Ligand binder design. Sequence first.
Ligand SMILES: O=C(O)CCC(=O)C(=O)O
Ligand SMILES: [Mn+2]
Length: 213
Amino acid sequence: EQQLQKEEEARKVKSGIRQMRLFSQDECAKIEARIDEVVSRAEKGLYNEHTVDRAPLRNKYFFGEGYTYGPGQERLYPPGDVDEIPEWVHQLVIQKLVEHRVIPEGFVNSAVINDYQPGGCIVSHVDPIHIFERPIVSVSFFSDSALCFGCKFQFKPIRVSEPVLSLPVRRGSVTVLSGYAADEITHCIRPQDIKERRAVIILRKTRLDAPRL
Ligand SMILES: O=C(O)CCC(=O)C(=O)O
Ligand SMILES: [Mn+2]
């Protein structure tokens, strides 16, 4: 069988991935406390309708900009519909990324927190190309996990038992997605890779021509 094709694809995906450990135990602890605060405030109904997206395995919290249901016709909510990026995100997360030249100042106009229960997951998807610019930066928080690329296995486990690549994502680590890894392949999380609670902050810039609702 041609498993050289799988090695070619994995190499192409590797080239769109950069990773650095940026946040110490203490820094992570402080951000985690704030994440916990977002969850509490969401339970209290303190956010706009489109800020919070509650689902069985995973909750998402949209700040700055957000979007609708996503076959692939995601739309951007009008200004004011989602809550603004909280100051602690600017101070504790974004600043540290700018200070380490991960992304430039003023790039980030969208912050999304994904909160996973054990056994939570993400189904195969590409980050909406018509909505977000690249690179796509994310920071992992409560525990360690794995990000998979080439997620055909979620649907055809007999034909292909495995992802093209699995990327470890440690607590306090920064993942940057671009090129092939962001545009040419899907990613996902396997339920089994989420043993304990895990949250992630995803920092992006929305496109200027992003279709609006
Ligand atoms: O949970 C992660 O590390 C990736 C998040 C993700 O794929 C998304 O919400 O778009
Ligand atoms: Mn994604």
